[PDB]
Write a protein that binds this ligand. Sequence first.
Ligand SMILES: [Cl-]
Ligand SMILES: [Cl-]
Ligand SMILES: [Cl-]
Ligand SMILES: [Cl-]
Ligand SMILES: [Mg+2]
Ligand SMILES: [Mg+2]
Ligand SMILES: [Mg+2]
Ligand SMILES: [Mg+2]
Ligand SMILES: [Mg+2]
Ligand SMILES: [Mg+2]
Ligand SMILES: [Mg+2]
Ligand SMILES: [Mg+2]
Ligand SMILES: [Mg+2]
Ligand SMILES: [Mg+2]
Ligand SMILES: [Mg+2]
Ligand SMILES: [Mg+2]
Ligand SMILES: [Mg+2]
Ligand SMILES: [Mg+2]
Ligand SMILES: [Mg+2]
Ligand SMILES: [Mg+2]
Ligand SMILES: [Mg+2]
Ligand SMILES: [Mg+2]
Ligand SMILES: [Mg+2]
Ligand SMILES: [Mg+2]
Ligand SMILES: [Mg+2]
Ligand SMILES: [Mg+2]
Lengths: 55, 185, 148, 220, 49, 159, 51
Amino acid sequence: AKSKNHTAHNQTRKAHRNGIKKPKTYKYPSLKGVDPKFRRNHKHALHGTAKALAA
Amino acid sequence: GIDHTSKQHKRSGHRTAPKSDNVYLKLLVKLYTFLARRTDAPFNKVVLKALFLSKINRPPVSVSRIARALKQEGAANKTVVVVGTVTDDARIFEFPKTTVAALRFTAGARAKIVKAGGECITLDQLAVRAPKGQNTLILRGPRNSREAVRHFGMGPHKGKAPRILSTGRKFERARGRRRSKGFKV
Amino acid sequence: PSRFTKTRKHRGHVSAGKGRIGKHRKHPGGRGMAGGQHHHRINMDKYHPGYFGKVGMRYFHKQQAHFWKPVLNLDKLWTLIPEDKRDQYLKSASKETAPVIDTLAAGYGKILGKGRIPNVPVIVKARFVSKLAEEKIRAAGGVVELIA
Amino acid sequence: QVAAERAARKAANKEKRAIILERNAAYQKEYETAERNIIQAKRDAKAAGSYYVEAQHKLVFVVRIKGINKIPPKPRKVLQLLRLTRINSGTFVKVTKATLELLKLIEPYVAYGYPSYSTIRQLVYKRGFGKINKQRVPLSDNAIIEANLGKYGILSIDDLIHEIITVGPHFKQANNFLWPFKLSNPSGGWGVPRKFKHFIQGGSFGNREEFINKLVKSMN
Amino acid sequence: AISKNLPILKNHFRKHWQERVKVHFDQAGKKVSRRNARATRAAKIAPRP
Amino acid sequence: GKSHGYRSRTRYMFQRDFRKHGAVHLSTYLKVYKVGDIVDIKANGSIQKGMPHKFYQGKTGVVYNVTKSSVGVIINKMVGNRYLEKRLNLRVEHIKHSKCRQEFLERVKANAAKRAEAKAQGVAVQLKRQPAQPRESRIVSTEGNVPQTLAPVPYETFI
Amino acid sequence: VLKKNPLKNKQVLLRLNPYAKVFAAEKLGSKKAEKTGTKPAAVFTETLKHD
RNA sequence: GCCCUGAAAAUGGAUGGCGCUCAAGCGUGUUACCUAUACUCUACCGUCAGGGUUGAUAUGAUGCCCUGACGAGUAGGCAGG
RNA sequence: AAAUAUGUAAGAAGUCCUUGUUACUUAAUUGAACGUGGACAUUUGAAUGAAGAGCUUUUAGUGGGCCAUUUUUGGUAAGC
RNA sequence: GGAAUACUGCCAGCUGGGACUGAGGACUGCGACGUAAGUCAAGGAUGCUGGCAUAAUGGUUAUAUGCCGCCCGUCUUGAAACACGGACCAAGGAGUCUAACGUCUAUGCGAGUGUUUGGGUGUAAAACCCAUACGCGUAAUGAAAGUGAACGUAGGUUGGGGCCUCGCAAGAGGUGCACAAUCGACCGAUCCUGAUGUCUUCGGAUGGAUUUGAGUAAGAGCAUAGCUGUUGGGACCCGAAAG
RNA sequence: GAAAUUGUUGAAAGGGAAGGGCAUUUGAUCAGACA
Ligand SMILES: [Cl-]
Ligand SMILES: [Cl-]
Ligand SMILES: [Cl-]
Ligand SMILES: [Cl-]
Ligand SMILES: [Mg+2]
Ligand SMILES: [Mg+2]
Ligand SMILES: [Mg+2]
Ligand SMILES: [Mg+2]
Ligand SMILES: [Mg+2]
Ligand SMILES: [Mg+2]
Ligand SMILES: [Mg+2]
Ligand SMILES: [Mg+2]
Ligand SMILES: [Mg+2]
Ligand SMILES: [Mg+2]
Ligand SMILES: [Mg+2]
Ligand SMILES: [Mg+2]
Ligand SMILES: [Mg+2]
Ligand SMILES: [Mg+2]
Ligand SMILES: [Mg+2]
Ligand SMILES: [Mg+2]
Ligand SMILES: [Mg+2]
Ligand SMILES: [Mg+2]
Ligand SMILES: [Mg+2]
Ligand SMILES: [Mg+2]
Ligand SMILES: [Mg+2]
Ligand SMILES: [Mg+2]
């Protein structure tokens, strides 16, 4: 007994019931995948400027 | 026929009354319902909504959290308002002389506040003193520290706790959790 | 109670909420944890990673009593002194009158240092102590006495 | 407080009606002068051997004539954005490039044209409702208009009509304040055996230009 | 029989467990019996403790 | 069976333009990319390293990382009923600066100049773009431009 | 409680639009237009009647 | 273009039927007219939303009242009875 | 080399002026990244609309489909 | 050369006939006409009159007439089906209880919480009272030996309700809990660095690392109860060929 | 001393089923105010 193989019928209508969410944007995006050499120095740069404003 | 752009007969989704049957709680709701209607003060509306919250949405606020809030610049002589329970905290050794208004005080929390010269009052006494919420600080406890939260959103590469009864060497530390056994998450 | 269940509301609705097509059969999919690696793998790989396999080394005839060692942090060290005596010790911080705390008698095995204690000397007796816990105790003028 | 405050309120109402009286008189001469200038401009061009080309229309009135079943998604979205969610609903639309392309997508579902002053006045007087706090409120008094559109300088029903026919700086606010008009079927019928063809081909949908006035008045 | 995010259960009920169910309905009755036994033993035995 | 390889169905997408084969001109390597720049992706068929997947052909993204011979680009991809964030490591041959804002930055500069210029003279500086408006009235003269009458033509074959 | 249509209920027509009294009194709905005498040029007439 | 020849199937038979020939047929144009649970206005029921009102001496503040919009439904969910 | 579909942008998380941090980078206070302080308010950067937006937990049924217009494959064709 | 009329459009021009509706229930509003007092068609019907006071209106029921109406239940893409069950009536007849749990909600107390294994007591399977333990929670992380959570107002930046100050308002500044994003610090594992000292092989200070954890960073849990969901049980009810 | 089912009596309808929906005629029967 052969049956249906594949179809995309009704799939777009299901997607538009609640979906198609535009991605939310955050200030300060995560630094995942950034060059490690840049991240090591930027950590030290942030530490130094903390003391300048604190003092 | 109408081509509706939104769902019909949709409820607001916000509590408009307490779920409980406490007679005294309904009296406080009746008092602040009147105040919120005829004072145009944002403090009264916030308190009225907070009285409808369930138990998980009203975490306890310890006296140490109260003491830290009073260390804010210019907040030393404000009345701390907690719509919920105030618990005791022995990790702190010095307590100021503030005034705290809360629904409930534990025996330890009440003793510590009174010992330092402060007073513990109810929310209806607060309304007489500050009908418009003058010189008030609203403190809320932590919601995400609840033990049930750490299991929400479980999945690969999510870093969430699994729902498990026994924790140990032989309980969910094999294949799927280390590269030596198939793969790691 | 039975009168509040949805069974009462399903009276007169044929399928009792189980559907007409799928129906409510005996055991579709097997019993218990059946098919954990074949047709329930997805639900096992997520929500339960690490279930299949073995990791550590065995331990024949393990007795839990050998590993009894409750931990107490420094931020709760003064709770072992009864409240009616805490106040006089805090205001009279001096040598030759340091209170003695027996953590073992209170049911603790090791003292860990997390919080901050007042600058008051105290004599702490314990079976075990962490390096940081001893330093904070001695910084306040106290001492740790090892016991068994 | 039995006669002092009431007298002050009556005095203020007298002043408000005087302002409305002068504005309506000024609007009347503005309409009359503009109509005569256009007519005289055509005669002058013909006398000089030239042709006077009238400026393109700046306002249209759009009426939905199709039901809510079996509508493709893109035209369906455009009808919702024009606040035409049921048959025989109507709204005013300002004519720009960004709105002309919208009308092209919904041609087989609506009938629109260029309204006249008489049509606009009758629509607002009989079926004019205001959207106040998300509620449909009839425009039975000038105070409710002033309380909602006074910050834009609109304080009477004639001022609202003036902002519509002459597309003013605050056309968007004045037009959105008006609730979409609920019209009935035409009293003498549609005049065609089959509505769902283009007006050129003997149907009803599309742009019928000045002929929209006869259709709307029968539906009003 | 595995679905949703739930803990793994280990309920041991694959034998004829219903044949070996012990409900302590006589908890109050046995307390009365023990108190009676202590009372009658104290009187019977001696003025001993 | 079916075939779903990495470069499936890219027979024409990754070809070079006509009479534009060979080496890459040097201006491609002299351009400078910084984090936050907007770039568009177009693969080059002669550079097989750092090549994007065919889905990202013609897509536009934002640079988030800079390396020796490549940059990192962020792309929003719609999967199911929501968009997911995608990060790509592409060599500079496959990207170029997007002009979708170079003509917008000049409008920002123009707005500031016009706002300051009218500050001393006139209120309502009117720095909003407007769509095309309907034409105003005009007069058309027939001096030397008498209208010419046209009629439909009869049918002919001319085959 | 009951919407009353102006242009058929005169009292409502006077509540709104106080100028309605002046419009009716001066017969502004039947205002005669000033007579002009401009004539089209010969080029306009010849074009109109041209085949 | 219309009409005719080309054009043969089995119970009796179907432009739906009767019947119709400057049609009650075919192509085209102009009006009047008929009627859906659709559209417009009004009343009533319910649902949802936004608001008013604790003042005692008369009873329900889960009360009373004002305003606007909405109402198809298998499998299934929830609520009030 | 179309038509229809399709990516991005149209500002306050913006622009500009001045100058602080670093173990990165530069022949080099050169640059990169992140900041201190100053200047510009909502005709604050197109249109229309917006029963407000955002977010979380939990669970039912379903996982045999079929038809119409248009595009389209196998087949003489099929209510295939 | 001078008009008329047709066609189209406007009037806050006038006026006749017909039908349906009368919601609301002291006053309050906006207007109109008047020198005024007042009046009015102005935020929803009143005035006058006749017949009958009972089966007259109306309800119920049977019948007649016009139009309409195929047999329910079930599986199914599709049932009035030439698909299946059903001749009729009464009574019986199918998601239950239990052990262990997820989410949510109510209640008590709260860094704790749980009297009821047991003891005391009793108007005697109830109610009332209670010690010592034990369970869970308050510390995690490693296979393990083991080690074990403050550089700092328990950190910085951005967004934040409420509160505070100024202000008629609009706004500006101050403080900012919960929560969201991000950069750091702390604890365990892993990979490195290897000081003062030495049972010369022990000891592991100090400083690091695109590594890693169901962690810390002024606690939230424990107990009882309810709907819904999960698993083992006869397991919603009835049914095999077998062993 | 219920129903299925049956006898007698009374009323009504019936040209290849019967039963039903909306509306009204006819027959029978009935409550409510007489303020
Ligand atoms: Cl399908
Ligand atoms: Cl229900
Ligand atoms: Cl249709
Ligand atoms: Cl370890
Ligand atoms: Mg299938
Ligand atoms: Mg149902
Ligand atoms: Mg079934
Ligand atoms: Mg297999
Ligand atoms: Mg008619
Ligand atoms: Mg028709
Ligand atoms: Mg290679
Ligand atoms: Mg004909
Ligand atoms: Mg209808
Ligand atoms: Mg419904
Ligand atoms: Mg199936
Ligand atoms: Mg009758
Ligand atoms: Mg029929
Ligand atoms: Mg079949
Ligand atoms: Mg059937
Ligand atoms: Mg069968
Ligand atoms: Mg049968
Ligand atoms: Mg029965
Ligand atoms: Mg059997
Ligand atoms: Mg066998
Ligand atoms: Mg008998
Ligand atoms: Mg019988």
